[PDB]
Amino acid sequence: SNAKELIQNIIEESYTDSQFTLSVLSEKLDLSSGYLSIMFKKNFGIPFQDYLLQKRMEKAKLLLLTTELKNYEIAEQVGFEDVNYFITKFKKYYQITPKQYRE
Amino acid sequence: SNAKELIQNIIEESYTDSQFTLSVLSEKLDLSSGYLSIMFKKNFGIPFQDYLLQKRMEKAKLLLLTTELKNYEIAEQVGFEDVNYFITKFKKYYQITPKQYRE
């Protein structure tokens, strides 16, 4: 699917942007958010928001294991303006905290 | 504090807008997201994004109880970008469905 790969590329380029949302994507694709939400879930098997979260968590994982960056820095680099919100999402995703992930 | 009240009034005026984010609040308070992130959690005990979710869910219940609005309309009116994310967030937040809350 070319349209799936287009969507993949936009997200790969954009996920580090804390202002990147379903609405920004849909606008880039000339679609309503309402239709994109349905079509995304059809094509990828999970909701846009969960896919976006997964890309950010996977990058967070990478930075935690390969750098000495602080949580507030990693949060910023994976599209989170709030370091504590980042920590709460990470803990829900990996079941432990970013600090603990380095232990 | 008057501080907590000021921040609440501002959120109250804006939570309905799906484009309302921590960075918008920062602009309105004239504080960087770096500072606001931490100061908000100190005052409210949870991150801004969680507080924002809370206001939207409470409004969701008021709407469900007092109107015959459908889920897609409610999702729109409480600041979500698409109905499926709204109904999944509602389920997680309350662990019943909007329909179940209305029964």
Given the structure tokens 């908000």, which residue do they identify? B40
Rounded CA-CA distance B53/B62 in Å is 14
Q: Are A53 and A93 in contact (CB under 8 A)?
A: yes
- Which residue carries 């949870």 as its tokens? B46
Sequence-distant (≥ 6) Cβ neighbours of residue A91 within 8 angstroms: A97
- How far apart, in whole angstroms, are the C-alpha atoms of residue B78 and residue B61? 10
Chain A interface test: which of B36, B37, B51, B70 (most A C-beta within 10 Å): B37
CA neighbor of B57 nearest in space, from B4, B8, B15, B17: B15
* B66–A contact, CB cutoff 8 A: no
Q: How many angstroms separate the CA atoms of B13 and B4, rounded?
A: 15
Q: Which residues contact B3 (CB under 8 A, 6 or more apart)?
A: B43
What is d(CA A38, CA A41) in angstroms, rounded to the nearest whole number? 5
Encoding tokens for residue B28? Answer: 């309105």
Question: A18 CB near a chain B CB, below 8 Å?
Answer: yes
Breaks in chain A (C–N > 2.5 Å) following residue? none
Check if B1-55 and B56-103 are the same fold. yes
- Looking at A16-82, list the stretches that DSSP marks H as alpha helix, in order from N- to C-terminal side: 22-28, 33-44, 48-66, 71-77
Judged by CB atoms closer than 8 Å, whether chains meet at A33 and B81 is answered as yes
Q: Which long-range contacts (CB under 8 A, 24 or more apart) does A26-32 make?
A: none
Question: Could you tell me if B91 and B30 are in contact, meaning their C-beta atoms sit under 8 angstroms apart?
Answer: no
- Cβ contacts of A33 on chain B, cutoff 8 Å: 81-82
Are A81 and B47 an interchain contact pair (Cβ–Cβ within 8 Å)?
A: no
Token pair of B31, please? 């504080």
CA A67 to chain centre: 19
- Domain B56-103 grouped into CATH 1.10.3210.10: no
What is the SS3 string spanning B30-83? CCCHHHHHHHHHHHHCCCHHHHHHHHHHHHHHHHHHHCCCCHHHHHHHCCCCCH
Spell out the CATH class of B1-55. Answer: mainly alpha
CB contacts, 8 Å: B88 with chain A = 47
Resolution of the structure in the document, Å: 2.0
**Amino acid, single-letter form, for residue A47:** P
What are the φ and ψ backbone dihedral angles of B25, each rounded to 5 degrees? Answer: -60, -45
B6's enclosing H/E stretch is helix B2-14
User: Amino acid identity, residue B65?
Assistant: L
State the method: X-ray
Q: Domain spans of chain A?
A: 1-55, 56-103
